[PDB]
Design a protein around this ligand. Structure first.
Ligand code: HEM
Ligand code: HEM
Lengths: 145, 145
């Protein structure tokens, strides 16, 4: 149950999520593109899902990839803002899941995003503890897929 | 031309958008639902598009509607944050349009949102000047449909 997953977000986890987000969420365009590029670099098999974005190897220069990257960050912003109210976190997560389910994205595939997040966090000096906190937030979405 | 539409967002318009957003964007859940219910009350002919959300008449009590309403506000948040850079504003507006275009929503359909926005702004003491500023932002999205 998505609600049960939301329980893993204890006070210390929510704190690490907010503190780290204050940084990685402060440069959505730069960090958003870094996440996407890292995803394509380490998981080439996921490139096929984003054919609409054109040539993703262009990075920042690709307007379509840039628009998708910036927008992706606002979905994370939404999750972070709803942390203190499980009911709101749950309804936004389920809404979010709808489009991804239609694209046939399984819970395991979605889990591939954990790697990119871990590296982006590290680039900002946030270690394993923070990556584990984010893995738990990602787990909430997986509970809905 | 989306770019010519975006060029209509002058210093004064951007300032008015920011000032009004500071207030309405501070309660995304409340104002988001108010916007959606005003849309359904004033333009019943649009309800058919949100069949997945169930009984939208329930307002805040409808979890699906609540999740959608909060999420909608983050798209507006995204647009406001890109006001400094027209190139970034345009790329997120076009990314945003993709799903609506797939749903067959036309520019005429999208312009119906001007009414609900004007009414919500007014309930917060923001008059004509602000409603006109938001209509210019909506025109940018329309140019992309
Ligand atoms: C932190 C994780 C993720 C977040 C926050 C996220 C966010 C988003 C957002 C906000 C959209 C735009 C609205 C929509 O159409 O759904 C989107 C689109 C999409 N996402 Fe996700 N996503 C995530 C992970 C993934 C993963 C791991 C995959 C697949 C490997 C995936 C595949 C897609 C695809 C194919 C699209 C459509 C892109 C297009 O064709 O323009 N997403 N995602
Ligand atoms: C200021 C204007 C609007 C904003 C900011 C907005 C924002 C959003 C967002 C963020 C989503 C979720 C991502 C996606 O699926 O694309 C969405 C979904 C949707 N929008 Fe829009 N939208 C706007 C106007 C409209 C209008 C006027 C219509 C139709 C007349 C419409 C119909 C839909 C539908 C049917 C969905 C899917 C709802 C669901 O099943 O969850 N939107 N919109």
């Amino acid at each position: 149950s998505v609600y049960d997953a939301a329980a893993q977000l204890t006070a210390d986890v929510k704190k690490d999520l907010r503190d780290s987000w204050k940084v990685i969420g402060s440069d959505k365009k730069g960090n958003g593109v870094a996440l996407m590029t890292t995803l394509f670099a380490d998981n080439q098999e996921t490139i096929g899902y984003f054919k609409r974005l054109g040539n993703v190897s262009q990075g920042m220069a690709n307007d379509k990839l840039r628009g998708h990257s910036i927008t992706l960050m606002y979905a994370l912003q939404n999750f972070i803002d709803q942390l203190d109210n499980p009911d709101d976190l749950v309804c936004v997560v389920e809404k979010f899941a709808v489009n991804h389910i239609t694209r046939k994205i399984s819970a395991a595939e979605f889990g591939k995003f954990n790697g990119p997040i871990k590296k982006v966090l590290a680039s900002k000096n946030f270690g394993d503890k923070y990556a584990n906190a984010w893995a738990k937030l990602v787990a909430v979405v997986q509970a809905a897929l």
